[PDB]
Structures are given as C-alpha cells and as structure tokens.
Design a protein around this ligand. Structure first.
Ligand SMILES: Nc1ncnc2c1ncn2[C@@H]1O[C@H](COP(=O)(O)OP(=O)(O)O)[C@@H](O)[C@H]1O
Ligand SMILES: Nc1ncnc2c1ncn2[C@@H]1O[C@H](COP(=O)(O)OP(=O)(O)O)[C@@H](O)[C@H]1O
Ligand SMILES: Nc1ncnc2c1ncn2[C@@H]1O[C@H](COP(=O)(O)OP(=O)(O)O)[C@@H](O)[C@H]1O
Lengths: 721, 20, 474
C-alpha cells in the first residue's frame, strides 16, 4: 500500500518531494504536509510534499539527495505515509563530510548551514545527508545529533551546532558530487532514449536471462566533442549502480604490440567479473577506424580484437558496451552489424534551451549578481557545446575572482569561505568570458526546434492551415489515410516573390509540431555543385532521418539553375548534380520516418520538373506579396519587440507600402530603429521610436519586387491551374 | 499539525522562486 | 570468421586456419563456414601487408587441398563477390556462388512470423502490414524489430506488477500480449541496414491493375513468355527471340506497370533502374556501374531489367537543342555493350521506357538490342473507366460516384492524371472525416471538387510528337 515508483525530480530542493494531486487525496494529506518515505535497509526520510502539473500519478519525484538517504535508485519503489505529528526541534548538530571540505576554512554555519536552515522550516532526520552550495564549492553535511528524535522541523529559534572532526564517508554511501542525471542539461531526448535501452537489463537482470528476448549489447553515441557523450555514460552507470570501466583510444594505442590487444581483452574480463557493468570506449575512431584508412598490423589487429570481444557479449551476461565517436561512418563498418554496436544515438549540439540548462548546471555553486542573465547568454552562445559553456562559466568565475583577490591580498594555504561566498559574478564578467571563448562546433550543422511561431508570420492564414494538413494529419490521424487509401505527400515547394515568409512558414510548422528543423541554404547547394561533392546530399537526408521527426527545408532551390545562367542557361538541361542526388534520396525515403521535405524557390520556372512529380515535392503553394491587412500584421510582428511610440500609425504605413514585400517592411522597421538609436546616442553626448523615425525611414525604403516579377509568378501559378 | 503548516508555506515559497 | 583469424599474430593466423581444415577432415563429412571472408582474403590490389598476403595464399592452398580432404565442403560469406581475391573463385575452390539478396514483402512476413513464434500477439497485430512497411529491412532488422516490440510490451506490464525475484513467473509472460502499438513504436526505433541497397523482387503489380492496353498485354506475353514456354518452335523456324522492347509515349500511361505486370505473371525478378540512377552514373563519370546492373540481372535471372527515363541523359544534355556532341553518351554505350554480351539463355528480358523517343540513341533500337517498340497512347474512354476502377480498387468509393461520366469528362487526361483525381478526392474525404471528430465513404461531392483542380498533363502538341514517331515505325 502507498507504494510508488521513484522518478526524477525537477525541483532541486532537498526538502521537497512532488506528488500528483490524486495521490494527495488517496493519502489524505494536504499540500505541503510532512510525510515519511520508506527506503531500503530499514531507512527512511522526512520531507514536504508539494503538487505540480508534471508529476505522474503513480510516481514520486525526488532528487538525488533524498534517494541516497533512502538508499534507493531511480526505478525502485518506496512507500509514502503522512506524519502529521512532526514537531520542531531546539538543537541540531551538523558536521561536514571529510571528503568534501578540503582546502576551505571559515565559519561553516554563517556560510552554509545558516542560510540553509534559517526560517526554511526544513524537516530533518538523524543521519540525513544534504548538500549546501555556495562559494564555488559543493559541501555536503551529515546530521549526527538532535534533541528530538527521530526527526523534527527546524524552527527560526533552533540552534545549529558544529564541533568535532569531519565525518569519514561510509563505503556504501556515494558522494553527492558524483555524475548523475541532474548534471546533464540539453539532449534530454537522447538521455531518455538511452535510459530505456540500458536501465532495464541493468536493474532487472533476472528479466532478460529468463526470457527469449535479448537485451541491447552495444550503444554507439556520436556527435561533436564536448557534447556530453562521456557525461551520459557516467551518469547511467552511477544512477543504475553498474560497474563502470573506462576505455579510451590514447590509453590503448599508446601501448606496444601485444599489450594493446591484451589490455582491451582484460577490460572485457573485468566487466564480466563485476557484472552488471558498462564498458565505455571513448574516441572509438582512434581504436577501430574504418579499415580502408589504415594498413598497420597493430591497427588491423585491434579492430579484429574489438570485434571478437563484442561478439563474446553473448556469454558475458549483463555487460553493455558503450562507445563514443564523432561520426558513425568513421569506424570499421563491421562494428555496426547485427549485434556488437547495433544501436546508435545522435547526441548533437544543445539548442538555446539546452544551453541555458547547461549554464544553470555549471553555475550551481556560483553566486551570481542580479544583472546576470543566463538566458541572454544562451542565446548569444551560438555554436557552443557543453564543454565550451563549462569553460565559459569557468572564465567568468576567474575574472570575478581576480578582481577581488587583488584587493583583499589574503595569501594562505586555505581559502576563506566568507570571501568566496560573498563574491558575485556580474554580467560584465560573463560578457568578457564570451569574448574570450571560442566555440568548438561553430561550423557544425545546426538541428533544433525553431523558435518561430505562427504569431511571427503576418497574413497567409490559408497557408498556415494547409501546412497543418500536410504535416500533422498524416501522423495524428493515420487510420483515416489508411481507410481511404491515401498516400500522404512527402513534401511541398513554396514559390513566389522573395521576402514573403517562405522560410518562416517552414520554421513555424516545425515549431508547432515540435520537430527538428534542418536548414539548407543556397550557398550549401552551390558548394556541393561547384565542388563536385553532391554525395554530401546523402548525409543531409540521413541527418534528417537521424533527427526525425524533423522538417528538412531546402531554400533557394534554384540557386544552381541560376548559377548555370538562369534566364538563358548553358548547353545542358534542367537536371544537375545536386538536385539529382536530392531526387534519389527522396525516392528512398519513407513517410514512416516522420521527415517532411519543404522547398522554396524565387524562380519556379527554372526548377527541374522532376522535383514536382508524385513522390517528391508534388504540392505547390504560392506565397504572394502581402495585402493591406497582412502588411499591418507584418509590421506588428516585426515590431513586436520594439519600443514603438503610440504615435506610429502602422495602418497608414501599410497603405503606402502597397507593393512592398515582408522583407521590405522589415527594412522600414529596422531603419526607423537605427534612427532612434542614433538620436538616443547623441542625447548622451530617445525612450521610444517616434513617428518621425518611421517617416524618415519611408524616404529610403522601396519595394524590391517589381510588377514584371509579380507577373512571372502569376503566370506560373496560372500554368498550375 | 502547525509545524507542518509552517513547513508547507516555506516549501511552496521556495518552489515558486525556482519555477519563476 | 575474419576477426578470429586476423586478431592473431603472424604465424598464429595461418596455423589456426590450417587447423580448421584438418579438424573438418577428421570429422568428415563436415562443413567449414568462413564468415566475413573479405576480412581474411580481400582483393590483393587492396592490401600490401605480409600477413594479409600470406593468409590469402594459405587459404588458396587449403582450398586446393580439398581434392584429398574427401567430403569436406567449405562455405563462405561475403558482402560482394568482387571484394575478395579473384583467385578464390577460379575452377575449384569457391567456384559456386549463391546470391542471397534481401527478403521481399512475402519473405519479410515469413521472417516476422518466425521470430514471433514464442510471442503472444494481440488480435490487433497485423504482421503483413508490418512486412509491407519494413522497406529496406533484412532479417537481422526484423529480428531486432520483434525484440524491441517485445521489450516495450514487457516494460508496460513489469512496471505495474512489480515482481522481483530470481526467476520469472511463466504465467506473467504467458498472459502478456504484444499489441500493434508496440510494433509501431518499434518500427519508429528500428533503422534498416539495407536502406540504400538495390531492391530485386517479383512485383505485386498484376494485369488487373492496368486499365486498357489489351493488345499490349498480349504482345508482351508473346515477347517474354513464348521464348521460354515454347523454345522448340523458335528453333524449328530459325527465329531469333527479341532481347527487349522499348516503350514510348506520353508520361503517366502505364509504361512502368506494363514492365512490372509481365514480370509478375512470369514470376520473374523485377529490377528497376530509374532516371536519377542513369543520371548519377553520367554526372559522376561512373558508367562502369552499368556492368554491375546487368550482372545483377544475370544473378537474379529469370528477371526483367527495366530502364525508365531512358532519355534522362539526352535531356540533361539539352534535349530539344542538345550540346556539341551526338546522341551517344557514356552510360548508354555501357548499356549497349552489356546487352550485346548477354545471351537469351539467361532468361533476362530488357525493357526500356522513354517519354521522348526522338532523342534516344538509335543504336539501342538495332537488332540485338531494344528492337521492338510499343506505343502506349493516352487511354480512351473505355480504358479511362478501367483506370479509375483500378486506381479506386482499394478506396471506399460511394455508390453515387459515376466513374463512367467522369471518364467522359477527362477526355484528354493520362492515367496519372486520373490518379490525381482519385487521390485528391480521397484527401477531401479525409479532411472532412477528421473534422467530424473535432465520412464513411468518398462521396460524389469529393470527386466533383477534385475536378476543379485536376488537369491534363499531356498537351496536343506533345500527342502529335508521339504520333509522328509511331507513324515512322508503321
Ligand atoms: N549536455 C551537457 N550538460 C552538462 N554538461 C555538459 C554537457 N555536455 C558537456 N558537458 C560538460 O562538458 C564536458 C564534456 O567533457 P567529456 O564528457 O569528457 O567529453 P568528451 O567525451 O568529448 O571528452 C564536461 O565538463 C561536462 O560536464
Ligand atoms: N509574412 C511575414 N510576416 C512577418 N515577417 C515577414 C513576412 N514575410 C517576410 N517577413 C520578413 O522578411 C524577412 C525574410 O523572410 P524569409 O522568409 O527569410 O525570406 P526568404 O524565405 O525569401 O528567404 C524575415 O526576417 C521577416 O522578418
Ligand atoms: N493504364 C493504367 N492503368 C492504371 N493506372 C495507370 C495507368 N496508366 C497510368 N496509371 C497511373 O499512373 C501512375 C504512373 O504510372 P507509371 O507507369 O509509373 O508512369 P511512368 O511509366 O511514366 O513512370 C501509376 O501509379 C498509375 O496509378
């Protein structure tokens, strides 16, 4: 009774556990009541139960500190009961752990325990472990003695004591500073996918050896360096309790012939003896590279030795081998055949949301000033991976430290806890660190769910609805498409004047569908054509499959046709090297991968007609120049974030800009902003964008789409009937 | 009881600070 | 297996390979299976190491020793017959070859049935539907597919019963049914290992799926079946059977279906070469790959090798005007060469199709090549009705839909254009059905609305172009 599954928590607070409202009524407790949790080895913890809108009805969400106090792990089941008779205490004696307080001295109460306990009304039980962060250190404490027993709530008048030597950590008690799931920011989808593959055979080995269904034996993680490939592998082992054995290329390759193969074999033997176990092989491309790229005897033998050891996993029960590489095709293809490393996960690069989460994780111990805005930083850190955001936080910390250390001039063997605890890192120190940081993934393909929503696109009400039918219905209502024998469209081509929102349409539908957006721009299609490297199209479409569900957008689809002469052209026909590879990949792609192809062109009359045949971009949507009511909507969308004065008449501007594209209306908006900025800067040598700024902008802004080009699009649309 | 109600107000306030 | 032999040191890999042959002889009759042969004896031109050169020579001598090692058969597995030392494939040694290929839709269903023998399936599970969706999968992927579907079903129950012990309860597993949702989930997680491999299978298209063209159906049977059903008559009369036929005519008139339907009735493997593949070879100056296409046709024989969009390169070269050269190009010349070297005794029939016969290299039409030419016209009124019925054969068409009147209106429409009407009307019925939940059949209103957008794709200017060519051929 009252036995619920232990899940992950969102609230980091060590005294808070989340339960769904229906369980508050089954347990007959009120929101914020104090409950006890029953764990393993006759242990229990006391905490406060709060409600939210995310906890599963049958799960209890608790953080790492509570799980360790209960000696339980994620996926276990614990009992919850109310304890309405909890009272307050008068005396609590807390001591630090010997393995966490090192190199730092000072008044531990004033720095750590006082802000933790004072007026917090936390429940505490004898023997509890809890973590207090501050001063750029993570210091864990154990509660050893209290006047009431077995537990109490700390009151504002409760006296906290701390006298005696640091406590030696128990051999069965893991440190709270070890890598866990709460240390991973972005790439949550990949972490969840991996957990499903590994946690079941590792937590319940009796299940798999008792059934005819075999577990996954090898998982290959890939992505740029510094994205958390090792961080995940460690978090999985530490959270499930599996024995973790570390392998890396340099360690194996630095050994002599006969030593590298032997050490690799020993690693597998050690994992079996300590099973369940995880073997993590980092820099796999340094151990078993594609055979065609090496001819040395040592490299050929170590490839064969790894392949035989992976095959031996049929007998080495409960051992899972994880590997990290930069690219799935940099290694011997044999490794990826049935068995061995037959599961793959694409870690990728954190997006703007993931980068914010990473910055929040690597600042947990840092005291930040009120002017620090980590969301603003996450938006500016384009091209960075978690390793670079960690370096960014480190550099910002060091700049703040130098500023104070050169003023206090305190030199000793240890650091004063109060000095670090009162050191705040300002936005200027993060901005400085951003100038010093250099992203390691600057030229990598960016795959993320776009922040563009329908509210950012003026007009085009009918196109918005049409995209929903093309993209959502085939997967939200698949039984109707089967019922009527309909073959869902694989993609749509947008055509029309430039600057009318074709790109935003592809992004907005990807956003509403929560699908990854992959942007291929004209220069990329031209690069493949000019360099005779059209084979790279296969990697683009394969990335779309890897990132599915996703929307793969090919902008400037005519870029090559124009590069070949456009209006006159050369001696050949419409087909070219790059579009032909695009046609090939589309024909081999199934709608069951949830990959939707969108194209865009400003010159539909020169698009290879093959792309418009059934099975390709068979749907065609015309995006006209915005009409009067749409131009007003466009101005409001483009100015959504600007401090526009109340005297600005956007409807009047829309009436004047009769022949303007959406991009042309943006130039007016940005030009008026520039004028307001110039005047504002001059006033310091203004609070809003005034009508005069928009009126002056109108003196330069012109329509970019002439009537000759409008008819070109109308004639094509008429040809389509 | 009343000590649990005082902990309820403190836990709810810290949750709102983390969510906001 | 390669890894087991290659992981050994010089002097150990050759010794272990020799021992394997000695053990088989002692235990004869015996079979020696060498997996990943390309890892032991790769083509010599691709390796220069002493260990790789010696193990190639050692395997060759051990294979030759089979003249004395009575009743020992050595089987080997490779990815490609040309990835290994050609010496292995000479008279003796490995002089027999079998192309396993990739299971087709029927074979995939059989594999799914095999790897579910022990699984309890729910009434909603349809393995034939799965087999049709698992395009590009091999047996290893379907086995993984069934495993993943099983694990998803297991997790759903195990997290609810919470029974943790040393053994598993037989009743708990016996009452666990795997539903279609768990197979659909597994399909989303599965990633086929043969997605880009050539697909060679007997087509599911039958003559009942092709409207009209009654005389072409009969002609193709005479061209494809008679040379092998009645070979004694061709010898009696001194007739040389045709090696192939070229289809020409407007696009979307069934040229591809004709090639598939005759392959189906003959139970022959169908190999589809599409325009983009011919262009890929031309663009990348890799026309040598044509030899592998025709060699695959021989390996898969009996088969029908269909070259669609035979003019794709001629059009890529300018089509109506062209460039500074003539009709010949890199890819068609390799096709011409392979056809000349192909015998009718291999039961391989070559079919082409073009939408622009006026720009096909005339060499392909000479005796010994695609000497037969069949005109596929736009469907007439009685054929358009048959086409509509074929395209709607699987759709829930309402009784109020008058397909004969529709055929009368769509006078200038191709078969592909009639399909757009059928699919557009289906889309409209789906939209209305989905809205009703926020309908049981496709109503006349849906077809009438479809006619507001559907148009003929073949103009009268292009029809005359085909008629003039057909008239030249009598
Ligand atoms: N998604 C992430 N969330 C949090 N920290 C991350 C993430 N990705 C990378 N990091 C941090 O960046 C570093 C990555 O280094 P490591 O895991 O050793 O990678 P590699 O395998 O490339 O050596 C660590 O300090 C880790 O904490
Ligand atoms: N319908 C629209 N609503 C809002 N903004 C628009 C619209 N059309 C164009 N714009 C503005 O024009 C700019 C260019 O639009 P985009 O779709 O990127 O052009 P293209 O698709 O031709 O590359 C965008 O930054 C956007 O601000
Ligand atoms: N005679 C016909 N009977 C039935 N359907 C047809 C016929 N002709 C064309 N179609 C329809 O047109 C589509 C394209 O036919 P296909 O033969 O593939 O064209 P092509 O040979 O020009 O590539 C097919 O999917 C089919 O549904």
């Amino acid at each position: 009774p009252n036995r619920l599954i232990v899940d992950e928590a969102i609230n980091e607070d060590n005294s808070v556990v989340s339960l769904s409202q229906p369980k508050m009524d089954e347990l007959q407790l009120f929101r914020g009541d104090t409950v006890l949790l029953k764990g393993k080895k006759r242990r229990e913890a006391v905490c406060i139960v709060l409600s939210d809108d995310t906890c599963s009805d049958e799960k209890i969400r608790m953080n790492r500190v509570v799980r360790n106090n209960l000696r339980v792990r994620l996926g276990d089941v614990i009992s919850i009961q109310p304890c309405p008779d909890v009272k307050y205490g008068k005396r609590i004696h807390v001591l630090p752990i010997d393995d966490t307080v090192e190199g730092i001295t000072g008044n531990l109460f004033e720095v750590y325990l006082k802000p933790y306990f004072l007026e917090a009304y936390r429940p505490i039980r004898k023997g509890d472990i809890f973590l207090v962060r501050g001063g750029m250190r993570a210091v864990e404490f154990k509660v050893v003695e209290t006047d009431p027993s077995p537990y109490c709530i700390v009151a504002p008048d409760t006296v906290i004591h701390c006298e005696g030597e640091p406590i030696k950590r128990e051999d069965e008690e893991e440190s709270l500073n070890e890598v866990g799931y709460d240390d991973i920011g972005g790439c949550r989808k990949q972490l969840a996918q991996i957990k499903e593959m590994v946690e079941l055979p590792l937590r319940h080995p009796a299940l798999f050896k008792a059934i005819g269904v075999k577990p996954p034996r090898g998982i290959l993680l890939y992505g740029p360096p510094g994205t958390g490939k090792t961080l995940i592998a460690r978090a999985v082992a530490n959270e499930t309790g599996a024995f973790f054995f570390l392998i890396n290329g340099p360690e194996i390759m630095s050994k002599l012939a006969g030593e590298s193969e032997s050490n690799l074999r020993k690693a597998f033997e050690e994992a079996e003896k300590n099973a369940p176990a995880i073997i993590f092989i980092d820099e796999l491309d340094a151990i078993a590279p594609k055979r065609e790229k090496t001819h040395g005897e040592v490299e050929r033998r170590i490839v064969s030795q790894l392949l035989t050891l992976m095959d031996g996993l049929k007998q080495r029960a409960h051992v899972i081998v994880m590997a990290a590489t930069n690219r799935p095709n940099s290694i011997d293809p044999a490794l990826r055949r049935f068995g061995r490393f037959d599961r793959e996960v694409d870690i990728g690069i954190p997006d703007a949301t993931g980068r914010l989460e990473i910055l929040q994780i690597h600042t947990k111990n840092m005291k930040l000033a009120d002017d620090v805005d980590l969301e603003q930083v996450a938006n500016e850190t384009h091209g960075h991976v978690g390793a670079d955001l960690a370096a960014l936080c480190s550099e910002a910390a060091l700049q703040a430290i130098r500023k104070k250390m050169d003023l206090i001039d305190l030199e000793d063997e240890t650091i004063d806890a109060e000095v670090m605890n009162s050191l705040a890192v300002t936005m200027d120190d993060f901005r400085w660190a951003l100038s010093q940081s250099n992203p390691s993934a600057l030229r990598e393909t960016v795959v993320e769910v776009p922040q563009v929503t329908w509210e950012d696109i003026g007009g085009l009400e009918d196109v918005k609805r049409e995209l929903q039918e093309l993209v959502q219905y085939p997967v939200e209502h698949p039984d109707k498409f089967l019922k009527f024998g309909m073959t869902p469209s694989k993609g749509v081509l947008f055509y029309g004047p430039p600057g009318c929102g074709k790109t935003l349409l592809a992004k907005a539908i990807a956003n509403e569908c929560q699908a990854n957006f992959i942007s291929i721009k004209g220069p990329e299609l031209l690069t493949m054509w000019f360099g005779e490297s059209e084979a790279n199209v296969r990697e683009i479409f394969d990335k779309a499959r890897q990132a599915a569900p996703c929307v793969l957008f090919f902008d400037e689809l005519d870029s090559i046709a124009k590069a070949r002469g456009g209006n006159i052209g050369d001696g050949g026909g419409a087909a070219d090297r790059v579009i032909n590879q695009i046609l090939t990949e589309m024909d081999g792609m199934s709608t069951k991968k949830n990959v939707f192809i969108i194209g865009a062109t400003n010159r539909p009359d020169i698009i290879d007609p093959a792309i418009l045949r059934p099975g390709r971009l068979d749907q065609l949507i015309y995006i006209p120049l915005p009409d009067e009511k749409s131009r007003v909507a466009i101005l409001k969308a483009n100015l959504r974030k600007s401090p526009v004065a109340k005297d600005v008449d956007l409807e009047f501007l829309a009436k004047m800009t009769n022949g303007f594209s959406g991009a042309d209306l943006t130039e007016i908006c940005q030009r008026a902003c520039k004028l307001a900025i110039r005047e504002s800067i001059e006033s310091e040598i203004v609070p809003e964008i005034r009508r005069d700024h928009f009126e002056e902008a109108m003196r330069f802004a012109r329509r970019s789409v002439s009537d000759n080009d409008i008819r070109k699009y109308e004639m094509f649309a008429q040809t389509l009937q | 009881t009343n000590e649990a109600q005082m902990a309820a107000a403190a836990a709810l306030a810290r949750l709102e600070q983390k969510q906001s």
